[PDB]
A paper describes a structure:
Periplasmic adaptor proteins are essential components of bacterial tripartite multidrug efflux pumps. [name] shows the archetypal linear, flexible, multi-domain architecture evident among proteobacteria and retains the lipoyl, β-barrel and membrane-proximal domains that interact with the periplasmic domains of the inner membrane transporter. However, it lacks the α-hairpin domain shown to establish extensive coiled-coil interactions with the periplasmic entrance helices of the outer membrane-anchored TolC exit duct. The adaptor multidomain structure is conserved throughout proteobacteria, but primary sequence comparison in the spirochete [name] suggested that a tripartite MDR pump, BesABC, included an adaptor that appeared to lack an α-hairpin.
The crystal structure of the complete [name] protein was solved by SAD in three space groups, P212121 (2.35 Å resolution), [name] (2.5 Å) and C2 (2.6 Å), in which either a monomer (C2) or four intertwined head-to-tail monomers ([name] and P212121) are present in the asymmetric unit. Given the protein is membrane localised by an N-terminal lipidation, this head-to-tail arrangement, also seen in the isolated CusB structure, cannot be physiologically relevant. The [name] monomer shows the archetypal, multidomain adaptor topology, with the MP, β-barrel, and lipoyl domains in linear arrangement (coloured orange, yellow and green, respectively). However, the expected final α-hairpin domain is completely absent, confirming what was predicted from sequence analysis, leaving only a nine residue loop (Pro106 to Leu114, blue in Fig. 1B) linking the two halves of the lipoyl domain. Density for this loop is visible only in the C2 monomer where it is stabilised by the loop of a neighbouring monomer in the crystal lattice, but high B-factors here and poorly defined density for the P212121 or [name] monomers indicate the small loop is highly flexible. In both the data-based assembly model of AcrAB-TolC and the in vitro co-crystal structure of an adaptor-transporter (CusBA) subcomplex tripartite pump assembly is facilitated by the flexibility of the adaptor’s serially-linked domains, which was confirmed by MD analysis of the closely related MexA. This ‘hinge’ flexibility at the inter-domain linkers is also evident in the [name] variant space groups which show movement of the lipoyl domain, relative to the other domains.
Residue numbers in the entry: 45 to 105, 114 to 317
Write the structure that this text describes.
């Protein structure tokens, strides 16, 4: 009797994705330029300060005033008290925190299957408090020829968006396909014999296994989504499978829970 561990298998969702990089940006924002030439006497702003359209944010040389062109928060200050500046010199950036946007550049071969409304995950770190849901908002019409990329825009949704701060780098996982209501199982359950693929199903009464042919629909992160003669709640060997054949007698050392029915991502 060969020792095996079996999974009580569940139907669920396995999802494919495209791995991108992007930046948290905002739709509504503006550069702050002076209205005359001269030197900076005072800066009446710090990062994070809220300012109103018209408000005086700095002072130049008489004293001349630099005003905010829109209402919002100060995102960056690119200028030092003491520096000389002119009407095309960027002193600081103002933007709204309620029009957040993720910008990314997708290579052309991937564009035709991306659609407004597609789901994405936005990641700034490894833990779930550092990940955020998003939807594709806009595909630019522009193809940049040198980079062979098209800009795609995502809008974050859901909770705790305070932690998606403007300016941040993010990894993006854009969902491209969902295989739904499929048996999911650890990949090592699948065994390749004579150019085909099988799993071993345990019969509890006879303490044996039956070798069932399967088709692997998709796999990622060591997880197979499969079709074939396998049903919810079948016991399928996930350790010891290499030593088995059809009808092999076994010893069920243990039974693991089925992989979650919810999406890998």
């Amino acid at each position: 009797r060969f020792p095996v561990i079996a999974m009580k298998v569940k139907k669920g969702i396995l999802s494919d994705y495209l791995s991108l990089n992007g930046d948290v940006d905002t739709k509504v924002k503006a550069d702050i330029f002076p209205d005359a030439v001269g030197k900076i006497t005072s800066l009446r702003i710090k990062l994070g300060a809220y300012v109103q359209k018209g408000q005086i944010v700095a002072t130049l040389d008489l004293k001349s005033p630099v005003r905010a062109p829109i209402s919002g928060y100060i995102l960056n200050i690119t200028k030092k008290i003491g520096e000389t500046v002119n009407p095309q010199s960027n002193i600081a950036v103002v933007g709204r925190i309620d029009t957040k946007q993720i910008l990314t550049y997708v290579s052309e071969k991937y564009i035709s299957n991306i659609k407004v409304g597609n789901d994405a995950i936005i990641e700034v770190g490894a833990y779930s408090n550092e990940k955020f849901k998003a939807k594709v908002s806009e595909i630019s019409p522009i193809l940049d020829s040198k980079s062979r990329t098209i800009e795609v825009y995502l809008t974050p949704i859901g909770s705790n968006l305070d932690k998606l701060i403007i300016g941040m780098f993010s990894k993006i996982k854009l969902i491209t396909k969902r295989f739904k209501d499929v048996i999911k199982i650890s990949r090592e359950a699948v065994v390749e014999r004579e150019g085909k693929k099988f799993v071993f199903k345990v019969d509890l009464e006879s303490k044996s296994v039956q070798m069932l042919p399967i088709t692997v629909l998709f796999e990622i992160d060591n997880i197979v989504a499969l079709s074939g003669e396998v049903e919810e709640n079948d016991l399928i060997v996930v350790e010891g499978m290499s030593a088995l054949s059809n009808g092999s007698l076994i010893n069920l050392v243990d039974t693991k829970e089925g992989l979650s029915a919810e999406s890998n991502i």
